[PDB]
Write a protein that binds this DNA or RNA. Sequence first.
RNA 1: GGAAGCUGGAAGACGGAAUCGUUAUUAAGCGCCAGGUAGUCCUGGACACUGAAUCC
RNA 2: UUUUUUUUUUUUUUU
RNA 3: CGUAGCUGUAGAUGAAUGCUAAUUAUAGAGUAU
RNA 4: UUUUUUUUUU
Lengths: 399, 119, 607, 525, 181
Amino acid sequence: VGVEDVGRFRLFDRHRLVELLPEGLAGELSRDVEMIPSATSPIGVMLRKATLELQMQLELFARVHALAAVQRGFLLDGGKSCVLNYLIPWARENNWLVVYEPLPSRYAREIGDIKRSSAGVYIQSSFSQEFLERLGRFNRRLLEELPVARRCYGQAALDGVHRLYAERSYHSLLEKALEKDLDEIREQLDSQLREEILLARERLALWHTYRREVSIPSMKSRLPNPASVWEIAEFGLQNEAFATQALYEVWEQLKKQTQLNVLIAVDEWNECFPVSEYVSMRYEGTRFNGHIPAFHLSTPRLLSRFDDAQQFQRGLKICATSWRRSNRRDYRPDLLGVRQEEIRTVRNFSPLEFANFVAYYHKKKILHEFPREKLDYFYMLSGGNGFQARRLLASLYGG
Amino acid sequence: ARRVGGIGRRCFLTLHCSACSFFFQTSDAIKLILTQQHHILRKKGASKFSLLPLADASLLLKRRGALVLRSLHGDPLVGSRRQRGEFAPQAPTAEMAKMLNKSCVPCPRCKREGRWEEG
Amino acid sequence: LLDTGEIVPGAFASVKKVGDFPLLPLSLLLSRLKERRQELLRDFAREEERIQRKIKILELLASQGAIGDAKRIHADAVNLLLLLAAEAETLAEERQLWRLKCEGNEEKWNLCISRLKELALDHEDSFLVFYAMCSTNRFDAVLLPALLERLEASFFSSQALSKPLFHPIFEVWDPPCESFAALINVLPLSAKAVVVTADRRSERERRENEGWLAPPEAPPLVLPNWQTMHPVDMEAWEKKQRRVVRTRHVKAKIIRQADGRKLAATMALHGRQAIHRDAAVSSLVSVAAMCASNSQRALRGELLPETLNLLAAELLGRSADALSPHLLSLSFLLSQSSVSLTERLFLHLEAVLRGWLEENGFVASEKRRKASEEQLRNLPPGLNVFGLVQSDTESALWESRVLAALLSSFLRVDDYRPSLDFVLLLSDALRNSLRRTAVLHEKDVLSLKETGALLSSFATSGYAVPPSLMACLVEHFLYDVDLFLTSSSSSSAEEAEQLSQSFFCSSRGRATPGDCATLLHSLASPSPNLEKLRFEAMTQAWRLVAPVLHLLQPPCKLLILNSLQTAHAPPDVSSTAFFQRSLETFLRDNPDVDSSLLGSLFGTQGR
Amino acid sequence: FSSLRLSQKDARGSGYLPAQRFLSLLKASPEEYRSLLREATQAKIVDPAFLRVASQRFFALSDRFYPPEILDILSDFASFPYSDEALLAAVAGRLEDQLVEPSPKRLAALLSLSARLGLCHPSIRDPLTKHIEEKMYAFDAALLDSLCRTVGSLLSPRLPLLDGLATQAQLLASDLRADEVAQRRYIALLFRCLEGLSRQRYSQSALVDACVACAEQHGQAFPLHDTLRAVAAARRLDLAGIEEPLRRSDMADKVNRATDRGDQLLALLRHLDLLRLRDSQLLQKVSEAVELHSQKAAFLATQLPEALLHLTRLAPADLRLPVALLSQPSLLAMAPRLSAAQLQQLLSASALVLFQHIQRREGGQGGDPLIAREAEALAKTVERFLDLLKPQFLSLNLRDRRALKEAASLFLVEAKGAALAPKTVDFCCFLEEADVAPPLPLAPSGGVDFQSVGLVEACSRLVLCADARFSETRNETTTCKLGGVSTDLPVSITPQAASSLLLTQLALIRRGILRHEIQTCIPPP
Amino acid sequence: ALSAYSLRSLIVTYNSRNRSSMNATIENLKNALRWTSPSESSSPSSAPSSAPSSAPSSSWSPFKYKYALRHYVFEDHRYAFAFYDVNSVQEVVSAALGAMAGETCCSCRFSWRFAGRPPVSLPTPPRLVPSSRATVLRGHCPTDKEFIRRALEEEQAVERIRKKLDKKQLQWFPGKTPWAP
RNA sequence: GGAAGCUGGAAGACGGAAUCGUUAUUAAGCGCCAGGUAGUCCUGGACACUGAAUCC
RNA sequence: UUUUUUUUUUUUUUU
RNA sequence: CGUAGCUGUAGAUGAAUGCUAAUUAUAGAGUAU
RNA sequence: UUUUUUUUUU
């Protein structure tokens, strides 16, 4: 390990990798592992130079907590998702709470349920249960031991909206109600100044009382006095009502207190902004043809806010986009939340790394015969791209 | 492959706004001006009040309302069969922008005076 | 080891460090080669090719020596450079014979460059040339970029670790091995900074100090004539040719590659690991130079502030014994960047200054003489500093330059107050008497190029220069002007001043002299021999800029014109001779600037 | 975040930064204008000429700045208060369009407009005051507390505006009423608000009863550095009962809780400046602590100059004598202190004390002077303090130089009155005739004469004197002599107000011809 | 001012319908040169403009089912010339028109230039002392190359602007606009 | 007369039989306009890309 | 071009 | 430019496009279901 | 075969 060891493959046990990554492999690596005929063969991942720069930052961040260390997430733009197969397993081995989500779009382009509400945020009861069930597979034994704060008890609505933001939707309804009821006091001049001021004072008294009686938020009365954060089993029991309120409660809880280092990795982040496959009546004439934007849903919105990374006093977030699901085009980075100083633009594989990749497949009995004479010839054909290299060599005998 | 706008991602049907950030096609322009007819009539100051019934929101979604919108929108993109080669249709936003700005129609996003532009 | 038959994952926790400790010249290496000659000989069509050439060079190296040039002036041009490079470094009635040999080596060294650049060097000869220059401290701003590409393409080649050594015997007696793979990995940290801190600017770059310059973008101007005009009947012309010649206009442009930046990024990461190892102070100076880059590293990744913060944290926690000697190089590089951990770092570095000067005898002239020498050549490996002081005749000639640049470095900071007012007076008085005895001659005179570096700092830090004028009476006018005219029409005046900044470059065009006029204006800031000398200096420098006051940068022209219409300026200078009609010329070109309020920036109001 | 900045060191000392970013500003895109403006904010030196150039161009380029950009640009003006007559026309031309029912802009817009010159009735006050009184049903707790400090600094308020915020706190505070939930949440939102409204001599019946502690046994309210708010609110016209439940407390009578050098002396001293309170028999114990604290070397060059300047007023509350502790017992070798940052603070302190010495028994009463030897010792300090400022004059910001002129002109009266050695060079070169960026004054809206206003250069940096009204309007025991040559009530706290007002009258008579001046215009404390 | 004008350039173009007719014009133009008062005569540059062609179609003898066709080709020729620094207008305009022969029309294009304020500055330079304290080819244009480059760039700019504006105002049924009635 | 939305249960998976001919940028597919002096064709004229096989 | 891009190709032209 | 490569849907037993209460465009006039 | 922006979410 170090600068001297760049572009090498690290062996991984088949059984150990599954336990460390219960959800699955990071990226499209599952398509390349099935090609190996041997079932007992190990899995190798190349150590690109982009991982060395990122790994060093995490080392200093852990030592400080025991303004020099970074306190914001990064962004990989341009093999951006290849590093995820080596950075996540390593961090998890160092007692780090890592949130794994390689396929966040599965909760937006599949069979589900939507229920409109006054808050204007659609919820998914069916997909809300799968988020916590998959996260607890490997992150267990730590959430239960972690305590729970008392300053963030129950200030979230059913759809995960804050109390202050949820009650604002009813401001218009209450505004007209008070205007019609003012005739009782308006109809009983005196100095032309105090008479008008006294009438206005009645509005303040009535508004204060109206903002605390009509609204009846649900303060998770099912659990009066919690003791931990992993002891919330009632969320898994009830799904029709208590599906989204508990999802946001854990999200807010992991910002205030600081006991353990955390990490969040969201892959394929370029397919969360575009429109979803849902249909509704929220279109702005011809903007969506009657479709629900992906960022307007509950689950996608939770992982579609990079400007909030500052509140993460425990850790930080990270995302990468390399697939061809949508044309990147200009891909404005300034109007999204990230800055120009936090974008890691990787490049194509160097000739040195290209040779190692070809030799790696030989040990796996993937290719038939790859003469050294044509080793450099194939570099110009595919251009050294990883996607074009594996596909070109797979179709043909290779070399 | 079959993208909208071609290789150069052309857009000859949308109009930008100087204020805020919101764009819409010419199809929605007709509906916006008709819906906000009360503000336009009062701004200036029976034969004059002929389009009052069309201001209804539900009437536009009916069979009768659908035909009225299509009548005004002549589909400028469609033309004669001889209009080939250099004689190709251009962006009709030049005429639409003038009417939208002179009528002083408020923007759905923020209530403002004439702030539309070609884009 | 795990029970599954794999490496324990706990081992891969931290990142390893780098070495680069040893550093030797090409002098002692040759001595060992000449001794181990009988042991090196112990070691298909290609079998003879790799043996015949491989032994001929061994016997020769110890093309007829260092004589028989010109006629002789391929690996021939490469091996010749070694003899000359090694001969020069040997130095580091008697002055007559020595000068004859010293001059010949320098003249021959430059001649070999012309033939070397005309042929593209191979991977096996590019590194040898670059390494030799570093030892001899003889770089080239034109040749460095060309040789940097070869070292990069081959480094990332497929045959890097598997390929054996180069056949020059130079690699046989080397610590590293595995051909270029590990050879560059164990490169001294001193030489690593060169790649990162490489100037890629061309000669056309003159819009910073010289003035305005319009670059051309259309060299070829193809115009037809009457004798070479195509006939009217062009249809038959094509039928009278063997093959197609004329074709549609299709020309391919040249796309610039990384140009060595790809290799520089990898080298930058090595310096980061060599910070928390508690190494020597001399070795740590190289890390700062790389982090203080301005044209290669840029700000792509968010690692620059992190590396700088770590370097400052370790540097602060050190003894004064090892920090006192190393003060000019560290302060010069650390002052070029701003970070949060700036005030705390500079406070520690200021305290040692008080004791360093007091112990050296600064307010027994041998104590101050030896101290300066170590800071000028011994400490700085290959750095080129303010005014080009870079790695004594009678008195106070070399030590003055060292002290001149030190003051400017502390006043350069942009994070907090540079220093205390009391320190400025003490520092100013320290050199006040020292410069008095600087031999009141020869070419060893303080040029305006290095003089302007100090005057520039005082014009931006908000600190007014003291009334002391002895520094201005030992510089510029004294011999830098009279000597220039002594050594060998209307249009003739312009060429006289233009020739000054041609080869020797006594001044940076309009960069250094530009601030000279502004400082002389503001000096005695209050107002209801110093007065006599100020008038003579202002007029002398004004007449040397007016003739060429047509091709200068607009930003520079404003400063010159601004510092003439002031109360401090001498009278009878703004008359209808060269300035009255020239004032409206600038205003007409740039009418957007204030016309009535011309003297508002630094006019009769001083500041 | 990890702040980092790189300097243009391409040629290592080529060109001139102040000049380089001067011509490009005349022709640049709207985005580039904002980027260059921030450079001067963090810069060391300030150029008055460059400030006017940016202001003039802002009005022309106001047609492409988004509403968020205008607020961000206005925010940068908070430091070094500076403005031009052409700046008001630009902001007034787009303030109406910015009214989109904003929740937070009610405070940010009001706070930014507090300084410089505002309160323009039929351009700015009409829309802001009309929109703030009807939006009292959505103000956050944090915003309401901050609004108290804003209204306090205003001049010539109206009953409808004051009453709007008075009733807002009564209902808001009741919700929290029903140890950290009250000790730092309930009491904090009570005394802070009462002081704000008390400045405008306004109070209602349904606020005093609720604000005061109902139970007299409610001890341990606030520390020594927060209890002064309750005392300052009272002692105005007829207020009492809030001070102590029966003038017998447990943490505010026996030398507070605990006073020491552990970062506590400065905190209490700073709180006494913005609160109009006189050191009574119990509050005078702070002066004694200075004698021992000044002995330490660390305290002599870390907080000594800051404390002396920030509490120069009310001489019989900090120093035993005006010259005893104001002398230089050991300052001969310790005079230098961070070039100019703290050295200038000593000059102002020596000037305010001079005014108190003269205006003590020569027609003002309220004390008596000391022996004539006191003046001799005082002059020995100022003579050696002004010289050190000559080479460090360029290392002062716009705000630092603005206040220097007020303290510099004072020495030009006593010296010639019938002395300082450097009074003919330093005091008659720049300190007498300054041309720094002159900000606009804070004028009321009671006169209703904004259609005929002007500007004249004088000590208060600008004034209201039009050509039509030129020399014509603005130009018993406490009214006869106190309203004449003094013209300063002993509300606010007069030691500073008297010095600024007297200098303004003289500066307007020496150069300009302006007779029959009606000063009035006494802002709240 | 009218007196301050000067003929910057004069682009002379030809349009001939026959190969022989175009060749005669070239020889006639050359003969008119090498006879002026100045040492070097005005030598314009050559610039061919391709050769447009047209050929309609018609059915072919009547009473046939369109089994054969007969085409009628109508070729054309063009030629363009460039001028720079035309000091003598009489010796250039007369020569160009006098070189015609047969059905060979012409189309000239004048180009004038007006000078602004004559730059007059830089008087006798100041001076002080220390205080002691030809090459003309046969068939080539005599004008400087710098002048041609400055004028050539202007021509390329006008052509681009004209093509862009002309394309915008090019639609069938002129005067028709959408939803105008 | 041309095109378009909506609506849609017009008639067809028959015949490996037989008649019209291609001398390779041939054959087989796909895409564009120039003229026909307002619109107005699946034919004719005319250009460009992918482009196999056989004993001819 | 390790602060560079963010991508299919036509039937006249850089004389 | 079209079949692109690439990539989502149903690895269509069910993709045939004519019929018409109804409008788009040229024209002086092409209308009635 | 379909992207965000002028700001009111701990």
